[PDB]
Amino acid sequence: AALVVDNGSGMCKAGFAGDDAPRAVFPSIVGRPRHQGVMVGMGQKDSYVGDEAQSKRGILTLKYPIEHGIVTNWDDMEKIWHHTFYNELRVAPEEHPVLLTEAPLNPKANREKMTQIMFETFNTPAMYVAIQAVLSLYASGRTTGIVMDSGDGVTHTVPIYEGYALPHAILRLDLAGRDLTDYLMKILTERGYSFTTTAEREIVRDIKEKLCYVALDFEQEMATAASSSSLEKSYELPDGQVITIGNERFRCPEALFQPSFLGMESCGIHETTFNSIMKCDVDIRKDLYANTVLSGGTTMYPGIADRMQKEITALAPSTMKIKIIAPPERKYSVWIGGSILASLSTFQQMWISKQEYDESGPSIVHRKCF
Amino acid sequence: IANQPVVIDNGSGVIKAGFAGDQIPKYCFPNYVGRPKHVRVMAGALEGDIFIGPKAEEHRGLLSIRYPMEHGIVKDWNDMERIWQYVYSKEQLQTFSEEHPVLLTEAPLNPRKNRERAAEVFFETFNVPALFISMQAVLSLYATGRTTGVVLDSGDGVTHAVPIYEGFAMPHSIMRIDIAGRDVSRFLRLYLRKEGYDFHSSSEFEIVKAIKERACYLSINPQKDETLETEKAQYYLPDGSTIEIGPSRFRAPELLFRPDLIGEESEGIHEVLVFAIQKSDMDLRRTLFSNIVLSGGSTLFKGFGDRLLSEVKKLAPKDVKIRISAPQERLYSTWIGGSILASLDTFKKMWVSKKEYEEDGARSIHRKTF
Amino acid sequence: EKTAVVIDLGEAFTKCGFAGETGPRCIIPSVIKKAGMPKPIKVVQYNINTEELYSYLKEFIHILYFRHLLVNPRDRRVVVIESVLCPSHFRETLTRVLFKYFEVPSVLLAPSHLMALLTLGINSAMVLDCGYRESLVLPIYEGIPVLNCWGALPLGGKALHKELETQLLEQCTVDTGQSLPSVMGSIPEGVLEDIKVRTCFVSDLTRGLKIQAAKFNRPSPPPNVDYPLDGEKILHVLGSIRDSVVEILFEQDNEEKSVATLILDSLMQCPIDTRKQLAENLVIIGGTSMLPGFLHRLLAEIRYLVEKPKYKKTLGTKTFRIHTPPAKANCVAWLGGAIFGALQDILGSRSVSKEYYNQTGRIPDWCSL
Numbered sequence A: 001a002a003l004v005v006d007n008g009s010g011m012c013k014a015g016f017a018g019d020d021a022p023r024a025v026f027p028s029i030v031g032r033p034r035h036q037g038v039m040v041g042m043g044q045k046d047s048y049v050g051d052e053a054q055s056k057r058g059i060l061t062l063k064y065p066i067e068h069g070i071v072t073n074w075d076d077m078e079k080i081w082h083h084t085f086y087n088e089l090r091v092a093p094e095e096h097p098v099l100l101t102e103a104p105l106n107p108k109a110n111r112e113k114m115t116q117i118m119f120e121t122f123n124t125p126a127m128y129v130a131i132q133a134v135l136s137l138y139a140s141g142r143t144t145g146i147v148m149d150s151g152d153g154v155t156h157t158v159p160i161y162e163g164y165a166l167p168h169a170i171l172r173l174d175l176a177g178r179d180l181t182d183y184l185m186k187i188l189t190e191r192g193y194s195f196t197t198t199a200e201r202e203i204v205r206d207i208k209e210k211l212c213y214v215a216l217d218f219e220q221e222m223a224t225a226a227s228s229s230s231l232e233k234s235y236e237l238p239d240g241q242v243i244t245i246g247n248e249r250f251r252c253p254e255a256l257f258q259p260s261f262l263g264m265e266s267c268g269i270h271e272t273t274f275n276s277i278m279k280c281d282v283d284i285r286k287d288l289y290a291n292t293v294l295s296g297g298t299t300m301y302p303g304i305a306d307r308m309q310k311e312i313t314a315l316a317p318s319t320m321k322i323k324i325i326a327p328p329e330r331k332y333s334v335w336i337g338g339s340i341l342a343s344l345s346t347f348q349q350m351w352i353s354k355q356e357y358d359e360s361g362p363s364i365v366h367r368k369c370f
Numbered sequence B: 001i002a003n004q005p006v007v008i009d010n011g012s013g014v015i016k017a018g019f020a021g022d023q024i025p026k027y028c029f030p031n032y033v034g035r036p037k038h039v040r041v042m043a044g045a046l047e048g049d050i051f052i053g054p055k056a057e058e059h060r061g062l063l064s065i066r067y068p069m070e071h072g073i074v075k076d077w078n079d080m081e082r083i084w085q086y087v088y089s090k091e092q093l094q095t096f097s098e099e100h101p102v103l104l105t106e107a108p109l110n111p112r113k114n115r116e117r118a119a120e121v122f123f124e125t126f127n128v129p130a131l132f133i134s135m136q137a138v139l140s141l142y143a144t145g146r147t148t149g150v151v152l153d154s155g156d157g158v159t160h161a162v163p164i165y166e167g168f169a170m171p172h173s174i175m176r177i178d179i180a181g182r183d184v185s186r187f188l189r190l191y192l193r194k195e196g197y198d199f200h201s202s203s204e205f206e207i208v209k210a211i212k213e214r215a216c217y218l219s220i221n222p223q224k225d226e227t228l229e230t231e232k233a234q235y236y237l238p239d240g241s242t243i244e245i246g247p248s249r250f251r252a253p254e255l256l257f258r259p260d261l262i263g264e265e266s267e268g269i270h271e272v273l274v275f276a277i278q279k280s281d282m283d284l285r286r287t288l289f290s291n292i293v294l295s296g297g298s299t300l301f302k303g304f305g306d307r308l309l310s311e312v313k314k315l316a317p318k319d320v321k322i323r324i325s326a327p328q329e330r331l332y333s334t335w336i337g338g339s340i341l342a343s344l345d346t347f348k349k350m351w352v353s354k355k356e357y358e359e360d361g362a363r364s365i366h367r368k369t370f
Numbered sequence C: 001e002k003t004a005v006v007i008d009l010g011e012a013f014t015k016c017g018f019a020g021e022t023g024p025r026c027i028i029p030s031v032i033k034k035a036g037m038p039k040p041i042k043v044v045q046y047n048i049n050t051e052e053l054y055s056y057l058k059e060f061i062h063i064l065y066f067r068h069l070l071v072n073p074r075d076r077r078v079v080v081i082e083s084v085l086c087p088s089h090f091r092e093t094l095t096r097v098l099f100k101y102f103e104v105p106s107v108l109l110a111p112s113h114l115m116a117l118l119t120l121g122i123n124s125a126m127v128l129d130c131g132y133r134e135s136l137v138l139p140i141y142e143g144i145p146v147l148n149c150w151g152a153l154p155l156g157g158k159a160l161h162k163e164l165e166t167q168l169l170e171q172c173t174v175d176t177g178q179s180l181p182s183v184m185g186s187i188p189e190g191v192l193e194d195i196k197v198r199t200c201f202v203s204d205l206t207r208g209l210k211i212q213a214a215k216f217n218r219p220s221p222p223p224n225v226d227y228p229l230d231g232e233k234i235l236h237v238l239g240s241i242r243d244s245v246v247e248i249l250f251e252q253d254n255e256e257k258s259v260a261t262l263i264l265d266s267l268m269q270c271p272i273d274t275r276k277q278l279a280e281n282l283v284i285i286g287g288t289s290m291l292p293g294f295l296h297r298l299l300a301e302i303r304y305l306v307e308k309p310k311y312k313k314t315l316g317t318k319t320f321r322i323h324t325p326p327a328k329a330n331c332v333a334w335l336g337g338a339i340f341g342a343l344q345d346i347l348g349s350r351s352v353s354k355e356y357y358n359q360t361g362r363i364p365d366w367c368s369l
């Protein structure tokens, strides 16, 4: 009946309500070609979208519409929604209701503009905007627990206890997968593997997904890298060329735990989660320590849950029992939560309608959200 | 051992050398290795079979030229060793490498492997007592006398913009492109194929550089110059035949502001200057706009600075006092700063000694530069 | 409804006919026959008076459409297959002659490499067009031609003609009317084309290396055959000479350039994602490619250059396949333009019309604004 559409900054995920996993999965990209006066043969698309842009990557200027969970170009975001509904899902938006997701502490105008596009342009019967962390917690099954959500757009934390979100203890963070990908691309240039153009941005992203892992101890990993060359793995590109890097596997995702490398002057993901828990009430800290949930693609590095356990225990008192909930399906946890929320019978009375939107306007969504 | 140190200003297009505490570099010549195309039948001919400096400039037609450096990064190391040997030899400097310390120059964000291999050459093949590698932006500010300001530069290899404020070089605010004088010469050659006057050989490529240096001007409005019909001005070759240049003279340097005509995605000179100022902190932006310094040979086009102002006025915030300063000696600005840096008493502390290199190795060179 | 005209101009030959027909109707050479003239003048020339070129193009078009097409092009569209990097001066002159003098309904100045790609029916390909004047490379990826990745040495038909003229003059053996070498200073171009078509045997890679070794401090000299000529002056042309003339096309040393190296330089310039599809689809077209036993010598030379250390660090292991076209190697560019014009009355709309030319000024070349 209802459609769930997790508009992620990287991978735009979408499908149906009451499902195990999403059908439509693709990178939210809109590649426009090299505009030269020379002609093109047997016709082509003026602006590609999704997997088509990824396939024909070499030529196209890959521009993401969402930057840090914030929609910059709205015409680009409108084309991706259109690509999700008609091409991938093969179903009109007028029949099915549409669950959407944004990160917490976003601009207030973005929900209003997102909702305006759904009702005016797409003619949706009913829509809703949920917090990503709230859905990630709902996919995991627990009512209680903090959610250290981390995608390519935005890392953020939302502490919740017994089905009561703590909006003032929320802490949004500028560090994310895209900033890690840019950092890996820079340190690759330092060892003679220069990647400037946006076509190579996806190759270094794919290198980041495969090889990189979180260090248990950074100074120890740096010492072993200088001594031995067993850690130095090789990755072959789409092209037959193959490259080898030693230091850059553990050093790339260390930027999460040490933002000083990127030049952000912010708290690391390990202590940002701690600072979120300390901002909550003193009586409900034990359960937040016990249920330290992870979600998103930036939590898919091997050994990240072990590093979070080391750092949070180091920050917190010795008496506390720290525990990180790190499921196998944490990459697609936000969408799974939306599918379970859409499947419930209580959610049928929580939708916005066309008549309610015509009466109120875009400002009705802020009341419905939280 | 504290003799008068040598300042070798590197560069892909041109290489310059001399001594510390001088006004202008006495020894300037283009950075390439000329090798003969034809057979040398007659006795008493040009001996050696490896031509560097004024001999290679004199005998263009015989020699197949090839540049060892590309985008501020040496490809052919044996050629650069021969050029450095020619600099030190009796044909140019008339001094030994054993006596004097060395001041080398490199572009920012280059491969570290090339910097290590550069140091290996200077320490082992030549027997240098002390070596120091430095940035181009820091040297330009030494030559002007300022501490604050952005340094936009445009040589033959690299175009980069490093913002510095009262002796504080910002590493994360650095922008870099592979669009420069060599590429501008390559597209002028491409455009002269469309005019009719085709060029192919590497000696014949230097005619295109000579046309670029002499007869090129940057239009303020490129759309207005296109709608109008050009006058088709003339130019005499070293051979004798006249060449109607036409619209290729104004469309060639447009590259630097519009790299979409390439078919390879780049920021451009005007965006890099704005982006470097934008990426720095909020309070530093207005001081960085007021102190903009130009350098390199590809800033010497007619109406370049007038266009570079107009692009800043378009992009930058309104009602801000822009000031693109530029010295009289723009090509030699980097060498003058090195000679000033070498003459200062602090220079002894900054360098890498031969003994320190033998003990530590590459790690000590990476620590001293930053 | 209306089958469009197809033209493919050039310095040596000119492929022309109807759109839709598999291959052209005729191919008259580029030169023209004038009354009261010693030698025939070439039509396609660069860097020369505007009004003279205009008259030369009118004269060539007039002798063309009566003999070739048998119709007025005033009824239907035209496809002028200009090679990319054909001078804008020459295009403007072509545009003037087609609209001002004749008054055609529409024209098109589309590139040769993209149309040659339409014949294969694949969207991505590395393409090489070895014509008369130049041997131009241009890779296409998914329709769009990648422009800054390119190359064109002055090493086509005209370079082979000049080498034949040099080597025959050095070692000459003419009959009486025996001895008597270097009697005539020069020889005509039409005869020298017929010698290249018939005599010139293209060598293998191992034979080519042996010839290069012999030139700088002799193996496999045969075979040799004489060539007949008018006015009772047969010349006994040798077998080692014609092989040496073919060898300069693949000569690497001291330029770092050749027909084979030009593809590798074009591949070097191209991006990383584009790289492998261009290597897989390497198309060879043009006039010089019609020579007997050419495609092996190229593919073997390409592979030898990839084995060299300088190209291993970028290219490495690559499956260099040469997907050949339906029509002959010279006439691939024309067949593509015939496919482009015949089928699509829709894609005729994107091209420049007579209504657009008068008010505006000119057909838009790949330039600013």
Ligand SMILES: Nc1ncnc2c1ncn2[C@@H]1O[C@H](COP(=O)(O)OP(=O)(O)OP(=O)(O)O)[C@@H](O)[C@H]1O
Pocket (backbone or CB within 6 Å): A006, A007, A008, A009, A010, A011, A012, A132, A150, A151, A152, A153, A154, A177, A178, A181, A205, A208, A209, A210, A296, A297, A298, A299, A300, A301, A331, A332, A334
């Ligand atoms: N196996 C992996 N290891 C490390 N990082 C990964 C891995 N897979 C994906 N990523 C990173 O995470 C991103 C995947 O996005 P994700 O599935 O988290 O949704 P999203 O688009 O970030 O939306 P949201 O912000 O709602 O999570 C990629 O852009 C990539 O940079």
Ligand SMILES: Nc1ncnc2c1ncn2[C@@H]1O[C@H](COP(=O)(O)OP(=O)(O)O)[C@@H](O)[C@H]1O
Pocket (backbone or CB within 6 Å): B010, B011, B012, B013, B014, B015, B154, B155, B156, B157, B158, B181, B182, B185, B209, B212, B213, B214, B295, B296, B297, B298, B300, B301, B331
């Ligand atoms: N007057 C000029 N106008 C335009 N371009 C010039 C002029 N003088 C030099 N150039 C170009 O700029 C280059 C010189 O810049 P330079 O900073 O020395 O580069 P590098 O430091 O990389 O050698 C030359 O290679 C030349 O192509």
Ligand SMILES: Nc1ncnc2c1ncn2[C@@H]1O[C@H](COP(=O)(O)OP(=O)(O)O)[C@@H](O)[C@H]1O
Pocket (backbone or CB within 6 Å): C009, C010, C011, C012, C013, C014, C130, C131, C132, C133, C157, C158, C193, C196, C197, C286, C287, C288, C290, C291, C330
């Ligand atoms: N059947 C053939 N066999 C061998 N060589 C040929 C044949 N036809 C043409 N050529 C050669 O190819 C050249 C023609 O090149 P062409 O494709 O017409 O270039 P362009 O189209 O740029 O003028 C001539 O120099 C000629 O010697």
